Amino acid sequence: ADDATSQAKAAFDSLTAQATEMSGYAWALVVLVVGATVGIKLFKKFVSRAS
Amino acid sequence: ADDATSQAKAAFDSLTAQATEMSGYAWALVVLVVGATVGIKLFKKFVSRAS
């Protein structure tokens, strides 16, 4: 049934938009972990600069 | 009687054409059950693909 594939198609479009919403939180979580590594690694840069 | 076998022959041809009409609905009913299994089993394929 091609009417059957219309029901499955609309639900797969809602599930892939759910994947872009959760993946958007994955870009923002690695935003805050990379903010920790840039701050901390500049602290170690000052360690070697005064050494 | 061979005239007797002419009456029985024509009624057996109508009964076997009735068997092809009902069997045609059996091909179409298993059309819609196999449409359910192809749709649903591609849903389970997406389950393992994102896993």
Side-chain angles (χ1 to χ4, degrees):
Chain A
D2 295 289
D3 306 292
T5 303
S6 298
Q7 293 290 83
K9 287 189 173 186
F12 297 134
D13 295 290
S14 295
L15 306 172
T16 316
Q18 285 165 246
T20 319
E21 296 165 301
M22 296 178 203
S23 297
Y25 298 104
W27 271 302
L29 200 159
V30 201
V31 165
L32 297 158
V33 182
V34 184
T37 327
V38 180
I40 299 151
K41 311 299 170 181
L42 289 169
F43 283 98
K44 290 290 182 76
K45 309 301 177 182
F46 284 67
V47 162
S48 297
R49 311 302 162 256
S51 295
Chain B
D2 295 289
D3 306 292
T5 303
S6 298
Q7 293 290 83
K9 287 189 173 186
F12 297 134
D13 295 290
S14 295
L15 306 172
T16 316
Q18 285 165 246
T20 319
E21 296 165 301
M22 296 178 203
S23 297
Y25 298 104
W27 271 302
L29 200 159
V30 201
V31 165
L32 297 158
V33 182
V34 184
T37 327
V38 180
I40 299 151
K41 311 299 170 181
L42 289 169
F43 283 98
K44 290 290 182 76
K45 309 301 177 182
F46 284 67
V47 162
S48 297
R49 311 302 162 256
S51 295

